[PDB]
Design a binder for this molecule. Structure first.
Ligand SMILES: *Cc1c(COP(=O)(O)O)cnc(C)c1O
Ligand SMILES: *Cc1c(COP(=O)(O)O)cnc(C)c1O
Lengths: 62, 711, 711
């Protein structure tokens, strides 16, 4: 129930989810706690972020 | 697969005339026609006859007595039921898997009906078979590629040599054309694990309830080496079980690791018990780490579930107390603990995914199932490394596997799905419990001694008998409750010779004499020795082999009570030494061997030589390095106290290792050496009963010599 | 046609010996001999076996139990009854159409009897067949006229080409020999309306109750354009229905006329009702003439009776209220409203000639009957010009018609004549009503959801259920009583998902998923989309094809209640996208689609869109003139308000047109544009259920484009 322009992930927590699986936890706008998100894998090797409306969003690095 | 059943007779003519016209049409496409009688007649043509795929009956006669019993035996079985004008379904026919094909009673259209049955039968073949086996059968009739491996190319080179034609005509044309390498595009490669091979591994994991089952093309002895090299780097610590196999010994000799051996339980008859629950604790494992030099935290544990005899464990307690991230379950003898309600929560696959851990199972395929040799599976339940275990599989598997074994390995998994596969496990249990009741029935009513089954006093139930602490049949001193279970199909016959307290008796017959009598009729004994027996009652053991075993046991009592001769009973033993076994009878040999067991005291020396583990000096990997350099010597058996052996001692009986390659026999393991010298004296007076110990070489004087390491 | 029945075994020898002698004589001329049992056995050899033409029975045994039941089925069926010395007729055997051939019991005269049966059988063939078909079969066995069209001449050129032999050997030698044109003298010509073709047109109109009827050899789509161009000059006014066909739209684009669209009724499930009785008034039609520029008095009216779903209207009220001299009825789905008493006064042919008017009907032949494709009829009921209507028929029919379809077109009129054809029309209704009762029986007794038939609560009758105003099963508000009928052979399955008031629910499965589940067994839904399942229960659906549909419906409930996977249920859908449809079950897909319908609000954006009509700027004939000159362009779907389209929008679902070629979307038809944009969003998330609109081209980004005209 809020807008976001950048999402930060932890390197020690990203390698575990991309190898063993499960769920990922990441904060929003660099503040707050590491909330759970609906992140999945893409067919074109990307990161699609799903929300409550089943919308796609490809992540990118600066 | 060409049996068509036509049940019942309506007595009219407009319904029997289409049957007579169809009788002459189905025979043109190679189909057997059978005419069953009543309802109980058709039920016997399915359980006993598996090559049936067509059931023709009137829909307006038995719409509920046939659609319920057939559904309990096969789900995809075609039902060529003929309906009428006023025909409808039933409310009790919604939750049943059936394949009903409706037709009419039209004259002249019998030819069109025969084409529909043949096409429907072809759909049944292309459905129950996996995509890997189906593609192999279709490749023979269509795929005709040239310039490929192997060089025979479907048996072409064998048709140009006189000696090659005899080898080609033995198997068949479809046999040689099915042996193809990875030179086929529409079948994929096994090393690549793509195409048909990708869906084949996911199909077996769904049937046997696993994540991604594998198909080993070298056997069970090889699968234990690939998995062992995963959770055991060059310098770690593993928790291998004491009751290990010959293949597990070479695993410790090829990896620079420090294994820790357990202390399983045992009785006096020789039946291998299990590991107590105290060894799975955290304070017990951590205590042996400091006492063992060069050993860190254990990262792998090997558990033999079940053992060679047939005693399951309790995985509901090991997967919570044993804090090992890599627990192994050598399921090389129980490839069925899934398709039965009396086997829930007893193996590694039953249950959920344990977090932070992983379960390995090397289930043997060509042991208690139906497939070619050199076949095994790997059941992984957890999280492993992707770029680690992949390299370990290619080091023991060739680049050109034999698809004839792969097609039979996945076939055993396809034979278990549905009601047709569930009746194979439950059918062997019902035949085993019935055989257990026939022993107790022929024991009290008989007049004299009779065989006994190692089973509780109450076998009325149909489940795994737990080994409680208030019983006297198991004979295990201080056993954990709700931890050791009994295998119903593993019937353990106990010959009269010992008491219930662990001592001996005056009248007794060893199990080695009975094992030689069963081989005369063709019955091969799996395990034998002191006063115990073991047989394999898998899904391939029908009611003929079960009833034939009891008849061979009753004939041994008749030949022993009447006091017959050895020549007129054991012709194979007489040919070994006709001079010594001349005037000897069956009662003289059975009593002379029984006195040697009491004199040499076998149950006391065997029970004390297995509990005290010898002192392990170095790791088993370092013992093999000294052998390649040429630092091995052969010494006598009576001159070896304080030396390091080179091979593994496997005395028969029993069937468990004694001294691991790399251990030393000091003053603590004194009864261990006494067990080897006792078998050399009892197995040297009567021919045929020689001492069988893997590792002891026989000389020209009688004293066995072992291979040790130089100082 | 070579089945001979011999009923009743007297037991004596002087009557059974001539039967044995006749058994060996009839087989020499290719005849099958059957022996029924009792009286009920012979009755089953006629309704199910239609290739029978000989019944042999004792006249002095069953003279009243067989001459009454057989007469109710076939009238011209020969009866080879054997009489005796004291034999006579009955007073109750005078008003029955039978063909009894008496004989005797004489030895040696069995050869003369066989010649009389073959001659009598030939008389039955030369009677039930029309003279047009009789001339076609006789020309194959005896006609040898050379130098005729086509060039193959029975398949002569096919015997000289390697590829031509495969196409000739598939059908048969007698198939190509019947392919002749107007190059035959003893068969006449179809365009000349003389000879056998003259008597064929009078035979079809007499059976179907008509004055003059033709034989269209290009389907119903062509017959509608011939009649429409007969009473619609350039610049007149026609009354075409809104629920028209693809061919009916092109008729407005080929003639410069001013059409006036009606306002049919509709509900929320997508089933279109009919035209209300208020639209047929004189003040309603005359009001739309002044509002529409360039429009005179309507001289032709096109009424779709029945529609695509199968809903009969009330012709007893249209032929008195509608003041149109040329009323047309699109009877492309009811080629049988005459052979049953529950269809009187429901079509145009039923009744009499209307004074000052004429009725046109295009009864389809290959749709719901038994004939080759591309076959239609033109039923004319009135006083029309023969020299004028004949020239309009040649404008779309070639000079060399295909007699293979013409022979089957008249065959449908002969297969329904008599009591033998009435058992097929009424038989399909009885099989349809029986299937309707099997759904309600398996709905309350079941434990959970079940399919529902769009039918009233009381179906305990055999007639057309009227759509009253005090019912909730149809859901048509402001409906007129005694105007809307129901076709019993048009079972519309209503899948759960909506309520009875027209809103949405919480648990339901769309009809699009069920449509693909039936395709695996060989069942294609005629109309699917929202929550309806239309099926065709014509004469081609026997008791086998009807009961096979109920079994597939019960399997969908079992597979959905147990929560199965998509790969293990829908193999055709899994091959479209194995990556996306991997970890998906049947319950996850059924719930995600149901939420998209409620979110996008489908029943509201479809009911309001079909109610309003876009502003028709010019006539549909003028829109096609601008397309030939090249004044067309492709624009986006979101940028088209205020433009004139070039093609007809046909979105799936449902199956009715949306915007006619030549209309403009202004501010009145706002929900019309919202219906197109809603389907583009719901049909893009999950594969397989893409948007199907005949007129919207798919690009490379997702947005569809339409074809409009240049400004
Ligand atoms: C019999 C056995 C093996 C050997 O099986 P193969 O498939 O023939 O190699 C390996 N491990 C155990 C525990 C066995 O009992
Ligand atoms: C199916 C249909 C047609 C087309 O029928 P054909 O004989 O194939 O030309 C024409 N009009 C209506 C109303 C139809 O349902």
């Amino acid at each position: 129930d809020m807008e976001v322009v950048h999402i930060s992930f932890e390197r020690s927590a990203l390698e575990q989810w991309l190898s063993k699986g499960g769920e990922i936890r990441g904060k929003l706008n660099g503040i707050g706690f590491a909330q759970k998100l609906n992140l999945e894998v893409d067919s074109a090797q990307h990161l699609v972020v799903r929300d409550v409306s089943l919308q796609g969003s490809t992540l990118a690095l600066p | 697969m060409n049996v068509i059943a036509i049940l019942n007779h309506m007595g009219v003519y407009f319904k029997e005339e289409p049957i007579r016209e169809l009788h002459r049409a189905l025979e043109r496409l190679n189909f057997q026609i059978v005419y069953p009688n009543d309802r109980d007649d058709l039920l016997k043509l399915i359980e006993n006859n598996a090559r049936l795929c067509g059931v023709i009956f009137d829909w307006d006669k038995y719409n509920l007595e046939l659609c319920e019993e057939i559904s309990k035996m096969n789900e995809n079985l075609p039902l060529y039921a003929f309906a009428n004008t006023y025909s409808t379904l039933d409310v009790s026919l919604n939750d049943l898997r059936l394949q009903i094909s409706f037709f009419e009673y039209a004259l002249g259209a019998a030819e069109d009906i025969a084409n529909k049955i043949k096409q429907t039968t072809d759909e049944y073949i292309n459905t129950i078979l996996p995509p890997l086996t189906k593609a192999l059968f279709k490749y023979v009739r269509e795929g005709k590629y040239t310039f490929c491996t192997p060089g025979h190319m479907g048996g072409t080179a064998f048709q140009k040599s006189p000696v090659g034609s005899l080898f080609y005509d033995f198997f068949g044309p479809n046999t040689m054309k099915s042996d193809i390498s990875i030179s086929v595009s529409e079948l994929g490669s096994l090393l690549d694990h793509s195409g048909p091979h990708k869906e084949a591994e996911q199909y077996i994991a769904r049937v046997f309830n696993a994540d991604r089952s594998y198909m080993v093309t070298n056997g069970t002895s090889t699968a234990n080496k690939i998995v062992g090299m995963y959770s055991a780097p060059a310098g770690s610590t593993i928790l291998i079980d004491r009751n290990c196999h010959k293949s597990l010994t070479h695993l410790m000799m090829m990896s620079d690791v420090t294994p820790i051996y357990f202390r399983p339980t045992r009785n006096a008859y020789g039946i291998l018990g299990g590991i107590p629950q105290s060894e799975f604790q955290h304070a017990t494992i951590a205590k042996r780490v400091k006492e063992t030099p060069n050993a860190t935290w254990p990262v792998h544990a090997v558990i033999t579930n079940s053992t060679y005899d047939g005693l399951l464990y309790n995985t509901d307690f090991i997967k919570k107390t044993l804090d090992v991230k890599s627990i192994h379950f050598d399921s090389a003898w129980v490839p069925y603990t899934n398709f039965s309600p009396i086997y829930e929560g007893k193996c590694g696959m039953s249950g959920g995914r344990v977090e932070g851990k992983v379960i390995y199972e090397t289930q043997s395929t060509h042991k208690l199932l139906a497939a070619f040799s050199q076949a095994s599976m790997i059941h992984v339940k957890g999280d492993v490394n992707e770029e680690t275990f992949n390299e370990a599989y290619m080091m023991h598997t060739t680049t050109s596997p034999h698809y004839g074994i792969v097609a039979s390995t996945e076939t055993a998994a396809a034979m278990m799905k549905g009601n047709a596969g569930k009746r194979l496990i439950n059918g062997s249990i019902e035949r085993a419990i019935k055989f257990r009741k026939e022993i107790k029935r022929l024991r009290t009513e008989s007049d004299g001694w009779f065989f006994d089954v190692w089973q509780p006093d109450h076998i009325d139930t149909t489940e795994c008998w737990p080994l409680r602490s208030d019983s006297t049949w198991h004979g295990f001193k201080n056993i954990d409750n709700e931890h050791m279970y009994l295998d119903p199909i593993k019937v353990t016959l106990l010959t009269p010779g010992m008491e219930k307290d662990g001592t001996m008796s005056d009248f007794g017959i060893p199990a080695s004499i009975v094992a030689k009598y069963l081989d005369e009729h063709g019955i091969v004994v799996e395990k034998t020795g002191p006063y115990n027996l073991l047989f394999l009652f898998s899904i391939g053991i029908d009611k003929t082999k079960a009833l034939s075993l009891l008849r061979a046991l009753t004939d041994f009592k008749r030949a022993f009570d009447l006091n017959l001769r050895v020549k007129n009973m054991l012709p194979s033993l007489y040919r070994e030494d006709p001079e010594f076994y001349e005037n000897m009878r069956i009662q003289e040999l059975a009593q002379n061997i029984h006195k040697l067991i009491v004199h040499h005291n076998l149950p006391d020396l065997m029970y004390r030589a297995f509990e005290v583990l010898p002192t392990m000096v170095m790791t088993p990997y370092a013992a093999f390095q000294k052998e390649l350099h040429g630092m091995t010597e052969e010494v006598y058996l009576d001159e070896m106290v304080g030396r390091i052996n080179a091979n593994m001692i496997l005395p028969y009986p029993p069937g468990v290792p004694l001294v691991m390659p790399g251990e030393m026999i000091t003053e603590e393991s004194r009864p261990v050496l006494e067990f080897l010298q006792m078998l050399c004296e009892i197995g040297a007076h009567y021919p045929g009963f020689e001492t069988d110990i893997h590792g002891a070489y026989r000389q020209a004087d009688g004293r066995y010599t072992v291979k040790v390491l130089k100082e």
